C-alpha cells in the first residue's frame with residue numbers, strides 16, 4: 001500500500017525559488033504558465049530543518065536518500081492558477097551627502113504570489129524494509145515528517161519578503177496505484193467575489209476527487225482519506241456522500257488518525 | 267481470443283525520458299518514451315531489483331513489440347539545478363557547488379502498446 | 386594477454402537485419418556493406434570512423450586499390466592487414482599500438498575518458514573511485530583512439546593536442562560503413578608516417594596526413610590485466626579480465642606547425658571554432674541548446690560542399706580543462722548554392738537570441754537581465770525550428786522571417802502572465818509583447 | 828482519444844513511433860528508419876544497444892475516435908435556489924405561525 005499527501009498552500013508575495021537570472025521558477029500546464037517550486041528545494045528545506053532534526057539505519061537516511069533507495073517522493077510544486085510575476089524597483093541610499101542626490105545603486109528584483117499544490121508519497125514497504133522490520137520508529141518518522149512538512153518553508157529571500165504562511169488544506173490518502181491530482185487545476189482558478197483563492201482551489205480538488213471516485217476507483221478496494229483544515233476552516237465537499245472520511249481541525253488529531261490507521265501505534 | 271497486448275497511459279504534469287546524448291551535466295530527454303525507460307517502469311512495478319533484472323526479466327521482455335502514439339506533444343522546459351550548496355561534495359571531499367540543467371516535458375501524454383505473450 | 390585488435394572482437398556493430406554484435410576489424414572490413422557502427426557516445430563513433438578512414442588510407446597507399454562507390458569491399462585489403470599483425474599489439478612488450486615508453490607519472494586508467502570523473506572531478510552522475518573500477522580491452526582501444534581529436538589541457542606543465550582546443554568536427558553520412566567510407570573518401574598528397582608504425586621522429590614543418598590524423602599528443606603505457614569479477618564502467622559488459630591502471634606522459638606540441646584536419650571548422654583567423662554551449666546563461670550568453678547553427682558558414686565556404694549528402698556534425702564543447710557537453714545532429718542537404726548574407730546571419734544566431742531576452746521595458750542601462758521568462762520558452766522554440774535545419778541553411782523553403790512565427794504562439798502565453806490585468810492598456814502591452822521577434826545582425 | 832475541457836482543440840495528425848519489424852522477407856530496413864539506443868541489458872552497470880525505429884502517423888476521427896469528457900466543471904460556490912410555491916415551505920410557514 002502507498003500513502004499520499006496532497007497539500008494546498010497560499011503564499012504571500014515573495015521569491016521562494018530563483019534561477020540563474022533571479023526570476024521565480026515557472027512551468028507550463030493547462031495551456032498557461034504557472035509558478036513553480038522545484039522539488040529538490042522542498043526536499044532540502046524539509047531535510048535540513050533544525051526543529052525537524054531536534055525532533056527525531058538513521059531515520060533521515062531511511063526516509064530520504066543517502067543501493068539505499070528512498071521511500072520519499074516529492075513532486076514539483078505546481079500552482080493552481082496563472083503565474084503573475086512582478087518587478088520591484090529598488091534604489092540604494094547613501095548616508096553621506098554629495099554634490100548631487102545620487103543613489104549608489106539602482107536595480108530591479110522579482111517576486112510572485114501563488115497558491116501552490118504539493119504532492120508527496122511514502123512507500124511503507126520500502127520504509128519498513130529500510131529499518132529491518134521496525135514499525136514504531138517508521139510511524140514515528142512518518143509523523144515527524146508530517147509535522148515538519150506542515151510547518152516548514154524555503155529560505156529563499158525570506159529576509160526581505162518573509163512569506164511564513166501556513167497550509168490551508170491537507171488530504172492524506174491510502175491507496176495502491178500512484179495518481180496525483182494535478183489534473184484538477186487544468187483549468188486555472190479564476191477568483192470571484194464570493195470565494196477566496198484557497199476556497200476555490202479546495203473546491204476544485206473536491207470536484208476532481210468526486211469525479212474520479214465516480215469513475216475508476218470501483219468497489220475493488222475502498223480508499224481511506226482524511227481531510228484537514230485549521231479549526232475546520234474549509235470543508236472539502238460539504239456532505240457529498242462523505243467524499244472525505246473525516247474532517248479534522250488540528251494537526252495532532254490528523255497525525256494520530258493516520259498513525260492509528262497505519263499501525264494503531266500512539 | 268485471449269488478449270495479447272498491454273496498453274500504458276503515460277501522462278503527467280512533468281515528464282522526462284532521458285536521451286543517450288546527455289553523458290554530462292546537461293541532462294536531456296527524448297520526445298517519446300524510450301523502450302528501456304518503460305522496461306524499467308515495468309520492472310519497478312514487478313518489484314525486480316537492478317541486479318535481478320539483468321539475468322532473465324529483461325531478455326524475456328525484450329522480445330515484445332512496442333509502439334507509442336502521441337496524444338499531446340508537450341513543451342520542453344528546462345530547470346537550473348544546483349547540488350551541494352552550503353555542503354561538501356564527494357571527491358576526499360570539496361566545499362563546492364555543482365551546476366546542472368535538467369530538461370522535462372510539460373503537459374504531454376503518450377499511449378504505449380506492448381504486444382507479446384498472453385501470459 | 387597480447388590481445389591483437391585484428392583478431393579480437395572489440396568494435397560494437399549493429400547489423401541491418403536487427404542483430405547487434407561485437408565483432409573484430411577484419412570482419413568489419415569484410416561486411417562494411419552490411420553493418421553500422423553502434424556507439425552511444427557520438428565522440429566514440431566519430432573517432433572510430435576516423436580510425437577506419439586512416440586504415441583505409443594506409444591500405445590504399447600500400448595496395449593501390451581505390452575504393453569505388455556502391456561496392457561491398459575493395460579486395461586484397463584483408464591480406465595486407467594480415468601482413469602487419471605484429472604492429473597493432475596490446476600488452477606483452479615489444480611493439481605496442483598507440484603505446485609509448487613507460488614512465489613514473491602513474492594515473493588511473495579513467496584519466497583518458499572524459500565522461501567518467503577522476504582526479505578531483507566531482508562524482509555525482511557516475512559513482513566511481515580511482516584504481517577501483519576497470520575497463521575491458523575494447524573500451525581500452527576506444528579510449529586510446531581518442532587523443533588526437535578529443536584531448537584537452539591539464540594543469541601546470543600540461544598542454545593540449547595538435548588541434549589546440551577541440552573544435553567542431555564535420556563530415557558526411559550514409560546508410561552503411563562502405564557507403565560512409567566512399568562518401569568520405571579523399572586521398573591527400575603527403576601520407577606521412579602513421580603512429581601505429583612507431584617512427585614519430587617527424588621534426589618537419591609540413592605534417593602529413595597519417596602523421597597528423599594519428600598524432601598522439603601524449604605518451605602512454607597501459608598496464609597488465611588484473612583478475613577479478615566486476616563490470617566495465619563505460620559499457621557494463623560483465624568481464625573478468627579488467628585492467629585497472631596506466632602510465633601517462635605529456636608530449637608538447639611544437640609551435641610553427643601546420644596541420645589541418647580535413648573534417649574541422651576554423652574561424653576567420655584559423656582559431657579552431659568551438660561549440661559555444663554553457664549551463665549558466667550569463668550576461669553575454671543565453672541558453673538555447675543545439676549549437677548546430679554556428680559552423681555552417683566556415684564549412685560551407687571552403688571545399689566542404691558536396692551538394693547532396695547528410696552532415697554528421699559531432700559537437701563537443703568544453704571550457705579550459707572541463708568538458709561541458711557532447712551532442713550530434715544529422716542535416717540533409719541537396720545543393721542549391723545560396724548567398725552569404727543569410728548564411729552569415731544564420732551563423733550568428735547565438736547573439737540574436739541574447740538580444741531578444743535582454744530587452745526590458747524600463748530605463749536601466751545594459752547592467753540588466755531583461756525579461757527572464759522569454760529565456761524559458763527560447764529552447765523549445767529553437768528545438769522546434771531545428772527540425773528544418775537543412776531548409777534553413779539552403780534557404781529554399783525556410784527563412785528567418787518564416788521561423789519567427791514559432792515564437793508567436795509561445796509568446797502569447799507569456800504575455801498573459803506579464804500583463805495580467807483586463808484593462809485596455811494591459812491588452813495594448815500584451816499586443817506589443819507578441820511582436821518581439823529576433824533580429825539577425827552581424 | 829480523451830478530451831479535456833470543452834473549448835480545448837485537438838491535434839489533427841497524431842505521430843506514432845513504432846519498432847521496425849523485419850518479417851524475415853524485407854531483411855533490410857528502409858532509409859527512413861533511424862537508430863535509437865534504448866535496448867537495455869542491465870541497470871546497475873547500465874548497458875544499452877541500438878534498435879531500428881520507424882515513424883508513421885494517424886488521422887484523428889478516421890483512426891482514433893474522440894472520446895467525451897467526464898461530468899465535471901470548475902468549482903463554483905452554491906448559489907442556492909428559491910421556491911415558495913413549494914408545498915413543504917407552504918407547510919413550514921404554517922408550523923411557524
Ligand SMILES: [Zn+2]
Nearest residue numbers: 521524617620
Ligand atoms: Zn567496457
